[PDB]
PDB file of C-alpha atoms in Angstrom:
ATOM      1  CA  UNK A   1     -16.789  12.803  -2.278  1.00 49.19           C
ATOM      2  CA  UNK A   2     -16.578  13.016   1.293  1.00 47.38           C
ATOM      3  CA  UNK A   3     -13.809  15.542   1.391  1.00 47.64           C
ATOM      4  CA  UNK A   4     -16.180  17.843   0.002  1.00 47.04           C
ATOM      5  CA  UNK A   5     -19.757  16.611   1.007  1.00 46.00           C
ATOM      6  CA  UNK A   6     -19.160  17.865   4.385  1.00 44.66           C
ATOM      7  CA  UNK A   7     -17.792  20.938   6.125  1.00 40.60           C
ATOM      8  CA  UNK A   8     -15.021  18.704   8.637  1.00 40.72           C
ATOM      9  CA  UNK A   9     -13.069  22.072   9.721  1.00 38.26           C
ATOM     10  CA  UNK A  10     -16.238  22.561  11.974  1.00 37.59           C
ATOM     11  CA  UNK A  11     -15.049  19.455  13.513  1.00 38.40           C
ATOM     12  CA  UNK A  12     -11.789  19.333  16.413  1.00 37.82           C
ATOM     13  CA  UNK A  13      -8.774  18.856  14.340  1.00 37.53           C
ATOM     14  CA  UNK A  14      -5.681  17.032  15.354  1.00 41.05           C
ATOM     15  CA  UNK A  15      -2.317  16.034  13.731  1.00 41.89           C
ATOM     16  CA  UNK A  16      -1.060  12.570  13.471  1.00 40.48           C
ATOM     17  CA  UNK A  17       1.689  10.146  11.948  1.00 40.46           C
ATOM     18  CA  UNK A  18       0.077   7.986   9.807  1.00 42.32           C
ATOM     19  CA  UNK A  19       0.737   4.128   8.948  1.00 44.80           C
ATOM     20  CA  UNK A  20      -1.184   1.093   6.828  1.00 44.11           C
ATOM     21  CA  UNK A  21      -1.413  -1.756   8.173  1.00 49.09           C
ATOM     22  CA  UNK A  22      -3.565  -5.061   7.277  1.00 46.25           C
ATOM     23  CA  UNK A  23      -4.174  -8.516   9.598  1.00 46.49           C
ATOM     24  CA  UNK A  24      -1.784 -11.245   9.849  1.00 43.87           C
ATOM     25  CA  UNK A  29       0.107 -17.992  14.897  1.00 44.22           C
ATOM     26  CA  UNK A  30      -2.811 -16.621  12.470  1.00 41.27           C
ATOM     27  CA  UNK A  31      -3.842 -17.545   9.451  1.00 42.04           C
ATOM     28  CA  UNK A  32      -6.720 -16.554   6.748  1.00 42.97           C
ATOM     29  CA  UNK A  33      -9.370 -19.364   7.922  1.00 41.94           C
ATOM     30  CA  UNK A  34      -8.460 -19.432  11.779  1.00 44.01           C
ATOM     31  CA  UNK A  35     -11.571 -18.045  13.936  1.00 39.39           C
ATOM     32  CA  UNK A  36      -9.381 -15.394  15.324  1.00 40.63           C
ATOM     33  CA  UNK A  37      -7.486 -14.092  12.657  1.00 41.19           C
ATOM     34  CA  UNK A  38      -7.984 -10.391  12.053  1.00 41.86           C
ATOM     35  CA  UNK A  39      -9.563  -9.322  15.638  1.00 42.56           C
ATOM     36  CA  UNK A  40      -8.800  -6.425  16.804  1.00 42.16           C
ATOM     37  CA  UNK A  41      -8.246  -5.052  20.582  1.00 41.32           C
ATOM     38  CA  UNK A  42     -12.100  -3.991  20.556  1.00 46.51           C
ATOM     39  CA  UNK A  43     -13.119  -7.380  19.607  1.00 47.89           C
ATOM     40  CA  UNK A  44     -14.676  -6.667  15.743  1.00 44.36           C
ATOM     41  CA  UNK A  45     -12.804  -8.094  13.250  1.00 43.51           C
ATOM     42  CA  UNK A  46     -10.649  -5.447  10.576  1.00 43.36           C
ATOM     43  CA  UNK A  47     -12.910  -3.655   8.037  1.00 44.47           C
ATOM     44  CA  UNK A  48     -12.982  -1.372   5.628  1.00 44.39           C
ATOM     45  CA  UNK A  49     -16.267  -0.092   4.691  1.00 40.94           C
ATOM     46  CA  UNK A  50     -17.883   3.369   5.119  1.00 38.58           C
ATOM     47  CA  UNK A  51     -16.648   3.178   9.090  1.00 37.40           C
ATOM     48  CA  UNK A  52     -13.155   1.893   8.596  1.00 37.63           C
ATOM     49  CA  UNK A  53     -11.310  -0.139  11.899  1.00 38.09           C
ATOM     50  CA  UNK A  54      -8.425   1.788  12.892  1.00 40.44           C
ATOM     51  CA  UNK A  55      -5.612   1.669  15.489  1.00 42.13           C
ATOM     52  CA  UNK A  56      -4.791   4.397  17.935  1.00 45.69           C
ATOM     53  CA  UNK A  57      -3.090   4.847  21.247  1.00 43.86           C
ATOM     54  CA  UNK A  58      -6.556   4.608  23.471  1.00 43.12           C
ATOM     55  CA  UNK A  59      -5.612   7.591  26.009  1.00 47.56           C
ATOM     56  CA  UNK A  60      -5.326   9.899  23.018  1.00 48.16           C
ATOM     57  CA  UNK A  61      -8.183   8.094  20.960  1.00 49.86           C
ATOM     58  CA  UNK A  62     -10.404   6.146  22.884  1.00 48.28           C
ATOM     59  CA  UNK A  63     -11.521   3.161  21.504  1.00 46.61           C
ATOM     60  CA  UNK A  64     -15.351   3.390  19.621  1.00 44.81           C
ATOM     61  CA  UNK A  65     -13.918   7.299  18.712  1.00 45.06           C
ATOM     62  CA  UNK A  66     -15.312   8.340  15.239  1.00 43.18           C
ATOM     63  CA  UNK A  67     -12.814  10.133  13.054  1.00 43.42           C
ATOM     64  CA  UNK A  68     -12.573  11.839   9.180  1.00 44.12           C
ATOM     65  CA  UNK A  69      -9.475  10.996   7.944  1.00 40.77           C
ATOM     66  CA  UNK A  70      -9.209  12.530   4.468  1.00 40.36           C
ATOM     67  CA  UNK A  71      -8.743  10.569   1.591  1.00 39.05           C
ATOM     68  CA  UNK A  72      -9.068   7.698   3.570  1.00 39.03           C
ATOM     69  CA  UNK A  73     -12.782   7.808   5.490  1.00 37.52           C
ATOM     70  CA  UNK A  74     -14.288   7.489   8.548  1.00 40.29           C
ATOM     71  CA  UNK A  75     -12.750   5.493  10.902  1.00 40.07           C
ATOM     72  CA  UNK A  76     -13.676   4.458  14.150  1.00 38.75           C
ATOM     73  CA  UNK A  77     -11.014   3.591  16.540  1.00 37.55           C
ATOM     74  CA  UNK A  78     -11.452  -0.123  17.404  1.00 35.59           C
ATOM     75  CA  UNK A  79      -7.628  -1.305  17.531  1.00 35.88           C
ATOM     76  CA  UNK A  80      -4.516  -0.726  19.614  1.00 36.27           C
ATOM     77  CA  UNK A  81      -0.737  -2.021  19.575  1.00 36.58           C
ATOM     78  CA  UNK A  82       2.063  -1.617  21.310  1.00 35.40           C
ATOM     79  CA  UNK A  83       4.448   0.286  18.665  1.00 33.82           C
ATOM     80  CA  UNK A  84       0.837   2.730  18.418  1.00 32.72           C
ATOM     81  CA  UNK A  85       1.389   5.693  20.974  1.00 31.62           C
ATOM     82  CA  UNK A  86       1.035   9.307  21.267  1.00 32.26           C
ATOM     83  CA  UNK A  87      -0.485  10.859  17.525  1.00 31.42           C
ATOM     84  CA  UNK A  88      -0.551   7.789  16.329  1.00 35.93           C
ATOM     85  CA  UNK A  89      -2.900   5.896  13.530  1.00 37.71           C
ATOM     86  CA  UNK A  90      -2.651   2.896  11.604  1.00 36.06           C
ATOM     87  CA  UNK A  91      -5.159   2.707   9.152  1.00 36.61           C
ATOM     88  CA  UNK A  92      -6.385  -0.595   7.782  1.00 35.52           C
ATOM     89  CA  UNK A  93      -5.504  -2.048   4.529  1.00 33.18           C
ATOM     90  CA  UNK A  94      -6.833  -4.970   3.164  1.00 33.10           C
ATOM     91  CA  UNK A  95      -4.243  -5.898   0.757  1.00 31.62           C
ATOM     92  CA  UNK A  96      -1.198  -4.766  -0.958  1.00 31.28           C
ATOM     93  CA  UNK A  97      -3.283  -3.982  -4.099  1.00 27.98           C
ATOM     94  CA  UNK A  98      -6.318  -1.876  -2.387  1.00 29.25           C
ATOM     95  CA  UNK A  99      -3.331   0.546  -0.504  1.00 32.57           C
ATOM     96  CA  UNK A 100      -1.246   1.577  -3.865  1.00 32.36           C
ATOM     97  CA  UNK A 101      -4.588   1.955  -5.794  1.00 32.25           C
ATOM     98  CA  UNK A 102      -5.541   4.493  -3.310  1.00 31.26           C
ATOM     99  CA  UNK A 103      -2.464   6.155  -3.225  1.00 30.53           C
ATOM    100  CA  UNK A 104      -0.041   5.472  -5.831  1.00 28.49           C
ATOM    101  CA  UNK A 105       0.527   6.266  -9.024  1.00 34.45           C
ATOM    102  CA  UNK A 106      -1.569   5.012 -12.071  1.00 33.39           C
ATOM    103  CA  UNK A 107      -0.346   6.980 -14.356  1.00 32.83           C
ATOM    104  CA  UNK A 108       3.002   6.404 -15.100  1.00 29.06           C
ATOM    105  CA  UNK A 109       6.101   6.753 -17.237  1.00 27.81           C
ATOM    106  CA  UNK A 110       9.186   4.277 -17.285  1.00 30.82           C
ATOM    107  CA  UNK A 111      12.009   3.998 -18.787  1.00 31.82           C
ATOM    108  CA  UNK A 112      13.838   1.136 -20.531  1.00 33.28           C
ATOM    109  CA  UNK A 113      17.347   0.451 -19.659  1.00 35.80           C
ATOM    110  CA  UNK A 114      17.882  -2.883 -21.014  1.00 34.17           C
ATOM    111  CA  UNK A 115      15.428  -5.159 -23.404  1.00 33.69           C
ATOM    112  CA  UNK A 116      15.467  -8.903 -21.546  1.00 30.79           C
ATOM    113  CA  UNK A 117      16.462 -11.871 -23.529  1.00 32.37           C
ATOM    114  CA  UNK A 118      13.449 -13.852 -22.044  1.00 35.56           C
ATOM    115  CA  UNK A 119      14.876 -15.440 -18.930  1.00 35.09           C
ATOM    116  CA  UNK A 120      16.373 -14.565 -15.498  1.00 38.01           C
ATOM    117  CA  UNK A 121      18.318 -16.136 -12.563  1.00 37.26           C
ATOM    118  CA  UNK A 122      18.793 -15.468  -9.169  1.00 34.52           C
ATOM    119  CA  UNK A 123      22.947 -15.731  -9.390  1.00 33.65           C
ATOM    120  CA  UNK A 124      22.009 -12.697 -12.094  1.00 33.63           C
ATOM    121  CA  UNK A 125      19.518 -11.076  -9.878  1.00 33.86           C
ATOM    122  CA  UNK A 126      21.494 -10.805  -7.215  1.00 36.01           C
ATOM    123  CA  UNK A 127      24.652  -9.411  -9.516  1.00 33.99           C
ATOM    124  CA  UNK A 128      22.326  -6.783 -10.194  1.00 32.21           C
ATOM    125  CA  UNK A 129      21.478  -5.498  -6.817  1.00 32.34           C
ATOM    126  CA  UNK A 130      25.397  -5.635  -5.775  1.00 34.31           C
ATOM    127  CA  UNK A 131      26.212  -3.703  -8.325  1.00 33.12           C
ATOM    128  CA  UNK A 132      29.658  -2.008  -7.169  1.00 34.96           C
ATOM    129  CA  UNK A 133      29.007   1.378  -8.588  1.00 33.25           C
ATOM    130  CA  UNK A 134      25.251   1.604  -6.803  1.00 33.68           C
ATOM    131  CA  UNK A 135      25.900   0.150  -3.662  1.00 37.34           C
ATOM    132  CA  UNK A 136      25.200   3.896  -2.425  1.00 35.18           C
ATOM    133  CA  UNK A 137      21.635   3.740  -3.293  1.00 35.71           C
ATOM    134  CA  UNK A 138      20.837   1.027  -2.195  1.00 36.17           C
ATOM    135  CA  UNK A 139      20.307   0.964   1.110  1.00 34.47           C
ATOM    136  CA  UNK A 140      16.891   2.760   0.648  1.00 32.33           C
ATOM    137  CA  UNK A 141      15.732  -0.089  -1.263  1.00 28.93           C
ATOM    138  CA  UNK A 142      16.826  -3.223   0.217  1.00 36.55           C
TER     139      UNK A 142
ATOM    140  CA  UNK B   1      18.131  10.134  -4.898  1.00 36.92           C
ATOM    141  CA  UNK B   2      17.951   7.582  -7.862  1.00 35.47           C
ATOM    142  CA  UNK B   3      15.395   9.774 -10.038  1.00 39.38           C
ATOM    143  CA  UNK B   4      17.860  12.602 -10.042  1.00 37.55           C
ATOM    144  CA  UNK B   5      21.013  11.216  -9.957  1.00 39.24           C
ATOM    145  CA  UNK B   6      20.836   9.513 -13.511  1.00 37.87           C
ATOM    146  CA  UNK B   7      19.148  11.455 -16.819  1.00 39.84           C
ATOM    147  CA  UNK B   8      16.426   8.917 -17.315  1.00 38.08           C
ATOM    148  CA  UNK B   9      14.912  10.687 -20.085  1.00 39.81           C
ATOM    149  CA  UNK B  10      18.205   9.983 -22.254  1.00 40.67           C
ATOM    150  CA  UNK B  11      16.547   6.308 -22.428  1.00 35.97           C
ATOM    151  CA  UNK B  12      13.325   5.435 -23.678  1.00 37.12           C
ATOM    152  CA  UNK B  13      10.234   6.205 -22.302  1.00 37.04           C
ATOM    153  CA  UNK B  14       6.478   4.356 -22.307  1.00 37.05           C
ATOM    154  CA  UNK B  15       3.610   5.153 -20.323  1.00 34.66           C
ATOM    155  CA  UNK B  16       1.936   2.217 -17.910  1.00 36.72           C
ATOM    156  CA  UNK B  17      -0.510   1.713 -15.696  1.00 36.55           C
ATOM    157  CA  UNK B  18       0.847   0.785 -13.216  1.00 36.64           C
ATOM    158  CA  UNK B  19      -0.368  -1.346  -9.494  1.00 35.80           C
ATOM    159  CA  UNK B  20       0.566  -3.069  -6.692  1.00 35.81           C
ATOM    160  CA  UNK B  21       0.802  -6.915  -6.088  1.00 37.25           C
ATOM    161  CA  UNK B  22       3.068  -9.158  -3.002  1.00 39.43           C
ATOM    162  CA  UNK B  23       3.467 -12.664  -2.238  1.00 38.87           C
ATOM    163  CA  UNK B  24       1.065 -15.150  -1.526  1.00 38.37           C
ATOM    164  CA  UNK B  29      -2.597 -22.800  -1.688  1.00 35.86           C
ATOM    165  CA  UNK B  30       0.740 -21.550  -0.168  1.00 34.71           C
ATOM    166  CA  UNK B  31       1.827 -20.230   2.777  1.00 34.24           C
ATOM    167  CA  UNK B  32       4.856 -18.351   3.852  1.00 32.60           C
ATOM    168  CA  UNK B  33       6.931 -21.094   4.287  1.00 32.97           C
ATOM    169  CA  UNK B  34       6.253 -23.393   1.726  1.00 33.96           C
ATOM    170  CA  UNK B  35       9.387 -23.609  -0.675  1.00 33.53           C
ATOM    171  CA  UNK B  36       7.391 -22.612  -3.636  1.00 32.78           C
ATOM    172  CA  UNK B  37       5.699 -19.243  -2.096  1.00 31.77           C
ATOM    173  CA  UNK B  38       6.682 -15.914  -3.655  1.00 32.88           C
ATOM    174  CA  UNK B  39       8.227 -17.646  -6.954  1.00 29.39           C
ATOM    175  CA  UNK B  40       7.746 -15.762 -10.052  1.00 31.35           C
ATOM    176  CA  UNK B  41       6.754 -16.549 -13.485  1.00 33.86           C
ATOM    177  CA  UNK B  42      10.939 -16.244 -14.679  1.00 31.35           C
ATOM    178  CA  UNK B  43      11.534 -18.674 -11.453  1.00 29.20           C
ATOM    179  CA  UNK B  44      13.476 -16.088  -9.329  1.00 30.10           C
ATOM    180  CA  UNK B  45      11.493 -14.967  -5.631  1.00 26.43           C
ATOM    181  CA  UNK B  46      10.025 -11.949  -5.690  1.00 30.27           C
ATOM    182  CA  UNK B  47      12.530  -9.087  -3.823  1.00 31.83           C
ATOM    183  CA  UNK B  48      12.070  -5.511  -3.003  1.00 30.81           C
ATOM    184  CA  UNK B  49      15.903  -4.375  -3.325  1.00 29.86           C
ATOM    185  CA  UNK B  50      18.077  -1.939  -5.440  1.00 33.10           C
ATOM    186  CA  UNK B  51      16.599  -4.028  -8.364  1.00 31.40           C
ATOM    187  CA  UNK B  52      13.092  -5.082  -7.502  1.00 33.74           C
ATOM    188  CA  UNK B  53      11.362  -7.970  -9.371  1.00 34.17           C
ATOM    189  CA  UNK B  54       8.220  -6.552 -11.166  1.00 36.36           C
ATOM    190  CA  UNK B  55       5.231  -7.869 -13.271  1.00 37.56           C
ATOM    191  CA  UNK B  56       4.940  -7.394 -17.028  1.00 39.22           C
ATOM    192  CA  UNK B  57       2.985  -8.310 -20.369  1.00 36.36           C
ATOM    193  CA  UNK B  58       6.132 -10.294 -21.760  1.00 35.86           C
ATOM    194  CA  UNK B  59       4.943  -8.784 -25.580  1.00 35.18           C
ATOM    195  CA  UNK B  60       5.416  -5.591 -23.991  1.00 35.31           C
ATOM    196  CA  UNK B  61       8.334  -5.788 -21.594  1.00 33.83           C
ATOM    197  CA  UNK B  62      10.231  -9.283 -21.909  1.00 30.16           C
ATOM    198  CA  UNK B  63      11.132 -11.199 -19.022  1.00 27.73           C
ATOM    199  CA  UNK B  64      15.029 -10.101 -17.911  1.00 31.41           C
ATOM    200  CA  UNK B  65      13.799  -6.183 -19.066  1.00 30.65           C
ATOM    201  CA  UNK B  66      15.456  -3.467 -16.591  1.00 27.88           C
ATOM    202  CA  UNK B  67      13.035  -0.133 -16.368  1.00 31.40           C
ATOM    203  CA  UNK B  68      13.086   2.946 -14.010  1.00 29.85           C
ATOM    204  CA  UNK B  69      10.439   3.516 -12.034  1.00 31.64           C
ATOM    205  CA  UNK B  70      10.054   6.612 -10.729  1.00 35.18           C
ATOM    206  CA  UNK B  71       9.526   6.737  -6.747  1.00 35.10           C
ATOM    207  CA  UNK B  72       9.464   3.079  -7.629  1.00 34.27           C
ATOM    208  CA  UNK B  73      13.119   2.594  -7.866  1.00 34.27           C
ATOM    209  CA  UNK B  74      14.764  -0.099 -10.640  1.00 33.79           C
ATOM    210  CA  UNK B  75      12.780  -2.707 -12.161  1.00 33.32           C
ATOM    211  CA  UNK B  76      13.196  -6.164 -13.312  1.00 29.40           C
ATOM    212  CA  UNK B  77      10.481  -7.873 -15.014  1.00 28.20           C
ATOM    213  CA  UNK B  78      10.219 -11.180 -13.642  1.00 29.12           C
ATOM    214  CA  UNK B  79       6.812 -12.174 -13.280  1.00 30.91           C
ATOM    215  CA  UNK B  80       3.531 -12.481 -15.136  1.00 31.84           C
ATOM    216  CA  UNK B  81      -0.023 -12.805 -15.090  1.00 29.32           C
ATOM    217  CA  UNK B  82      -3.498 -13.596 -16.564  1.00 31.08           C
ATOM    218  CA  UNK B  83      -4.482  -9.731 -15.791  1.00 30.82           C
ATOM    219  CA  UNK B  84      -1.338  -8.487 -16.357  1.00 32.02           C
ATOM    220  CA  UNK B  85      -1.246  -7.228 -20.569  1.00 36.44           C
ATOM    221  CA  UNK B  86      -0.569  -4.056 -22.501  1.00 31.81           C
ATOM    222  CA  UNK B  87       1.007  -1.530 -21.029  1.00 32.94           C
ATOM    223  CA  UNK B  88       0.520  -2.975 -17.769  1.00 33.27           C
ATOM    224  CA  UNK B  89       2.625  -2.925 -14.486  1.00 34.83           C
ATOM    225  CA  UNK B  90       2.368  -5.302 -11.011  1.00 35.18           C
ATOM    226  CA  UNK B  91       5.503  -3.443  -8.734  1.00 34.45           C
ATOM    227  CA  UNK B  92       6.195  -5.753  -5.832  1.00 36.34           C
ATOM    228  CA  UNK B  93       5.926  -4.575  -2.387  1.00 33.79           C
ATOM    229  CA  UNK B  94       6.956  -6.405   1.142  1.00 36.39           C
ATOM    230  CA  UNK B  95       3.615  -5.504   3.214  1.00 38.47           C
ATOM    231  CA  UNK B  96       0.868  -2.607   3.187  1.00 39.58           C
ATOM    232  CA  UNK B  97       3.146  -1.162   6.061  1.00 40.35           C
ATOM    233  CA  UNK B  98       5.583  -0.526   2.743  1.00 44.06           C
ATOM    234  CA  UNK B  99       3.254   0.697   0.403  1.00 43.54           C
ATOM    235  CA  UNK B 100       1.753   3.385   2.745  1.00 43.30           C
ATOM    236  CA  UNK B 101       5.487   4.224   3.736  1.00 45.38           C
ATOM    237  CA  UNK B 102       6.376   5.080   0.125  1.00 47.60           C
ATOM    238  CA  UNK B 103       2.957   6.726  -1.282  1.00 45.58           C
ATOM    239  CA  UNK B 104       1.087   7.917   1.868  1.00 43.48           C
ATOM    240  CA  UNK B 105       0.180  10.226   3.647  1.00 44.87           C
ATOM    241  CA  UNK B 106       2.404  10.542   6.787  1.00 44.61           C
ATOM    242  CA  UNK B 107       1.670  13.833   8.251  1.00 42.08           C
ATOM    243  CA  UNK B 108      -1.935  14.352   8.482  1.00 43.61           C
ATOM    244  CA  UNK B 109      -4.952  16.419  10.178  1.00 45.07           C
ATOM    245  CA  UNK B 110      -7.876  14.368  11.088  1.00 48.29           C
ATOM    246  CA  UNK B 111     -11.079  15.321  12.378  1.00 48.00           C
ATOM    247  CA  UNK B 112     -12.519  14.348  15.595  1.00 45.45           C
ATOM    248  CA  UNK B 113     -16.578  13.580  15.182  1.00 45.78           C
ATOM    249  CA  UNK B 114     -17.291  11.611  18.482  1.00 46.03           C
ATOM    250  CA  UNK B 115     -15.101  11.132  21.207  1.00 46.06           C
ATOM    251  CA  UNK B 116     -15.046   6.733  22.001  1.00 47.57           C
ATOM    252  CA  UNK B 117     -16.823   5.138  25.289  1.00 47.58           C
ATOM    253  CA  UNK B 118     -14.039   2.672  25.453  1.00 47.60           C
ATOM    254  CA  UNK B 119     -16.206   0.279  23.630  1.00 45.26           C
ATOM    255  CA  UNK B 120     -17.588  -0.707  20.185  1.00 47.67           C
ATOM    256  CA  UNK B 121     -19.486  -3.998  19.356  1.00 48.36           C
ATOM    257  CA  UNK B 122     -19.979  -5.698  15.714  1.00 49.80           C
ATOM    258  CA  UNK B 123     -23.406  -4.434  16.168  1.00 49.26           C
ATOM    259  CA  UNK B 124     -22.478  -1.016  16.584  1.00 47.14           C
ATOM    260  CA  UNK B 125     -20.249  -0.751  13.829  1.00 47.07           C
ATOM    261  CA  UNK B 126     -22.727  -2.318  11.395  1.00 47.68           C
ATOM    262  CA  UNK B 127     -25.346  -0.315  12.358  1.00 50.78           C
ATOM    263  CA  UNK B 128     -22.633   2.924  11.262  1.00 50.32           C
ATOM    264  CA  UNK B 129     -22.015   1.481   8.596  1.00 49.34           C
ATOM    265  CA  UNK B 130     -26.111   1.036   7.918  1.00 50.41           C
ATOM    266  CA  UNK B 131     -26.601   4.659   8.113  1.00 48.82           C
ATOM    267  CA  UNK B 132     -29.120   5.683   5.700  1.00 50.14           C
ATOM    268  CA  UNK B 133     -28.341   9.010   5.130  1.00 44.82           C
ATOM    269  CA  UNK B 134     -24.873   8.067   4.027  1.00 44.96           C
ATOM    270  CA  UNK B 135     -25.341   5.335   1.879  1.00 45.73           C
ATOM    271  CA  UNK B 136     -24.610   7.321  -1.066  1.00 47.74           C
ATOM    272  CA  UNK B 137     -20.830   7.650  -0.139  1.00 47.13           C
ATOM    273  CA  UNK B 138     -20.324   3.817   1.059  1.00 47.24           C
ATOM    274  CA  UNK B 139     -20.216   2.213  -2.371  1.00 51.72           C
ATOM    275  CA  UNK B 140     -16.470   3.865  -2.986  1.00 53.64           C
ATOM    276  CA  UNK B 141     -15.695   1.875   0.346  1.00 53.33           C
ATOM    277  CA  UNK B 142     -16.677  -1.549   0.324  1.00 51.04           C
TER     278      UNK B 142
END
């Protein structure tokens, strides 16, 4: 892999915050759905479209970004400033299969009777006695 | 937090594989977008509505997640049997939040013009030499 092919600490390093981030008045048919500032449309491919803040990153700059690829600057936005990326995404999916968890053990707290409701949906998530943890969820 | 607050492994465990699905003919306002299989709207909230094999996991089933947070299975799908798993997340925004990489080094291999047409990035993305590596990509 990548990571490995080639030797990138002979390359400039520099630290960022990192976000995902994927395209969408726009929707998936309209001509000008997914453009970014640069003008080419999102991509990911070998040379990935990402966002940075221009005066740090100039747009058409080519970066490694591990575990993620190459990227070449090509987008910008105003929330993006400073040591800033947001790295493209196409879907949902395509992000947690690159970084979460496959593997996984769960545990069963209660066997469902077949059917749910909202009204019982939403008893569950005001729970009185978990009201503390949920504010990181909701 | 919620995976060390409660002794999980008091209840019983199975092993998934787990990915990532959200929302979405239908758009995001039509009444019917985001409605699970069980008839509920999908939710990211202390309890989370999650896909499930119903010969597995019935429909109404509460599991813990871990770094997930509590589950309720409340949807279903052609692709979704066994041990299987669709958690429900928001955006890509989300996903990368939760399993990302925020703080990260990347490497700078060309410094940007200002500038970069479709042509240009195709013809990266065309490189022969690295051809090899662009199949895990696209």
């Amino acid at each position: 892999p990548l990571e490995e092919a080639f030797d990138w600490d002979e390359y400039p390093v520099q630290r960022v915050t990192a976000t995902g981030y994927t395209a969408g008045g726009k929707n998936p048919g309209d001509p000008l759905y997914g453009l970014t500032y640069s003008g080419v449309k999102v991509k990911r491919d070998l040379y990935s479209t990402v966002a940075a803040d221009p005066s740090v990153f100039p747009i058409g700059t080519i970066l490694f970004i591990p575990n993620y690829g190459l990227g070449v600057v090509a987008d910008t936005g105003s929330a993006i400033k400073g040591n800033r990326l947001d790295l493209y995404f196409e879907t949902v999916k395509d992000v947690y299969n690159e970084w979460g968890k496959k593997t996984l053990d769960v545990y069963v707290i209660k066997k469902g009777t077949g059917k749910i409701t909202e009204d019982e949906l939403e008893k569950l998530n005001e729970t009185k006695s978990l009201q503390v943890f949920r504010n990181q969820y909701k």
